[PDB]
A paper describes a structure:
The protein yielded crystals that diffracted well, and molecular-replacement phasing followed by standard refinement approaches resulted in a model for the protein at a resolution at 1.38 Å. The difference electron-density maps associated with this structure were carefully scrutinized for evidence of any bound substrates or cofactors, but the only convincing densities were assigned to solutes in the crystallization medium (ethylene glycol and chloride ion). We hence considered the structure to be the unliganded or an “apo” form of the protein. The TP0037 crystal structure featured two domains with a cleft between them. The smaller domain which, by convention, we termed the “C” domain (“C” being an abbreviation for “catalytic”), comprised a central β-sheet flanked by α-helices. The second, larger domain, termed the NB domain (NB for “nucleotide-binding”) because of its role in binding the nucleotide-based cofactor NAD+ (or NADH), harbored a centrally located seven-strand parallel β-sheet. The interface between the monomers was formed almost entirely by the respective NB domains such that the two C domains were found on opposite ends of the dimer. The NB domain protuberances noted above figured prominently in the intermolecular contacts, reaching across the dimeric interface and interacting with each other. E264, H296, and R235 were the structural homologs of these amino acids in TP0037, and they adopted similar relative positions in the putative active site of the treponemal protein. Hence, the structure of TP0037 revealed that parts of the interdomain cleft closely resembled both the cofactor-binding site and the active site of a known d-lactate dehydrogenase (LbD-LDH).
Herein we have characterized the structural, biophysical, and biochemical properties of the first enzyme (d-lactate dehydrogenase [d-LDH]; TP0037) predicted in this pathway. Binding and enzymatic studies showed that recombinant TP0037 consumed d-lactate and NAD+ to produce pyruvate and NADH. The crystal structure of TP0037 revealed a fold similar to that of other d-acid dehydrogenases; residues in the cofactor-binding and active sites were homologous to those of other known d-LDHs. The crystal structure and solution biophysical experiments revealed the protein’s propensity to dimerize, akin to other d-LDHs.
Numbering used by the authors:
A (entry chain A), B (entry chain B): 1 to 331
Amino acid sequence: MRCVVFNLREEEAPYVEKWKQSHPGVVVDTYEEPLTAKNKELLKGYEGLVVMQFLAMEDEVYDYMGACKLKVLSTRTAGFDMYNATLLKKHGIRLTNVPSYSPNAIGEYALAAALQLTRHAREIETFVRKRDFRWQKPILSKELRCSRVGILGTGRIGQAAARLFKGVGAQVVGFDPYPNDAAKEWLTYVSMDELLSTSDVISLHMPATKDSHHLINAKTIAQMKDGVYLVNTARGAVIDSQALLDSLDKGKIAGAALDAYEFEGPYIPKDNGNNPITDTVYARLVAHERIIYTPHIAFYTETAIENMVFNSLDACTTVLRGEPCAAEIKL
Amino acid sequence: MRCVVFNLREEEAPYVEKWKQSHPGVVVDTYEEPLTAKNKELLKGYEGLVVMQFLAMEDEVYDYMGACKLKVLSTRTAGFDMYNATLLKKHGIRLTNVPSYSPNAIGEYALAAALQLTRHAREIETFVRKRDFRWQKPILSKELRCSRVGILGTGRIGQAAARLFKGVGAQVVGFDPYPNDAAKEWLTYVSMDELLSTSDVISLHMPATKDSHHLINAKTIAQMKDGVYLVNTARGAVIDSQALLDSLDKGKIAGAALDAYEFEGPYIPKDNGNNPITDTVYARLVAHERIIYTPHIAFYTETAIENMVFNSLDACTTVLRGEPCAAEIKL
Ligand SMILES: [Cl-]
Ligand SMILES: [Cl-]
């Protein structure tokens, strides 16, 4: 029952210690550094590997996992395509993930960002910095209780967002290819056309599929209300980014909050102070005056960290004991 | 029954027209400009005067109201100390105000500002500006559903805030000298000491009485949790401003959102681009990196404007009909 954790961030460390305290007899050694060809020897003697690493591990790292007879690689994230499933399977190494951390974290961020937009936070700041303290129409707001909010995607996260928008008084409508009864507690299902053409705020909550790809594009943006506000806490591929930029530049969309960009991979979650953004679309997005751009932090709350740590260690050790694990990805 | 409206702003005009459409036969003439000694003759023939004026009227204006036999001055605001009640009473002119516009507007702003603080909006934007897109502890957030929010003052506005905070999952506690049962739908009443010492976010909603003056001061701040967030949508006098600045500088209070400042009167709601803020406390406060300063706009929503217009015209005309008016200020 020997486990090693890499990529350990400072906020994760106390949760690892809490988990260890509640699970005596499990060895859990930790490293802040990533696992690479250069330090692969640190794997020796462990049966479980717990990681949160977007940087690719060289093939020789996986081969060394095989030579060490590693039994399971457990990621702390929902995504797992950043790991080499081919080599895991070849060496008989199992794989687990963490499918959900905190739906409420992401719904709460969607509400927070929506309120930054509808309450004109950035425009007020611009005026305040110039000492223009007037009560003037450009900063006059519409209350969410007088607004319609459209939720695109009604899985657990979309439902959390819908619940929160209804909780502040908004009329919430939803669209999903597979409507469910639970979401009807917080929203009314409508057609795509109705959601697009009548919503004051649109918040995206769809997973990555062939059918969510570029759902928000020049054609669907053209159907929206003039002055709509758009929030994206889903993956970036749901938006055709240039179409969004064009619509912001023309004033069709009054503002957007983007926590994701379709091609953010080279840059998230890294310090790029000395790493120029060479994707000119992304460089425009991140700097746009009408976009509240955030680096994929909708999830980034204490509750999410706790669940990422506890659930990954639980999954890892469940597999090590040869027990069924609902978070196991069969290869 | 003739009424004249001064100080008419762009956003108010459609509501005046809507009110006129449902009160055919009442003359309601409008002016965008203020009423002053230079245009006092515009008062001839009017019985009701409806105002929202930021500039003192000279004594001779009030004397001219008396000569014209004006019956009532009706403000569109809750405050009325900006008008010369001494001369209104001398000339037998009655006074009405608008005690409430949209409690939800102000509660919604308190929630919006709280979420800017708890979700680290400004700190994230500062990292984004530097292209630092790391998931780093300074921008890790605590969800409101895992937080205690303390509501100081449980009138209509505090109740609206409490309802909205509960609506996003927070555990809401309240303190008031006179607890009421309506507020108990949304919060639990606790002692002042308990509210101060256990709240993650404190939102102020108390009227400006001797008892609430500098309620937030060096002593009560010292009772708070390290890293508390503070929101003030109430009047500025409930906070000892220098004590707040000191505690922000020392890191005791992690951040504050202030929609008001005790000595803001010379500057609100004016364009001060050509008017220095000579009050050095206010100048520091508006510029402080840990303060989200806004120019008294928590109320500033479409619904509030509609209610300011409708309620002032209703009060004015109720008085002119010789009927009792709950919004009349007896001088
Ligand atoms: Cl509104
Ligand atoms: Cl949390």
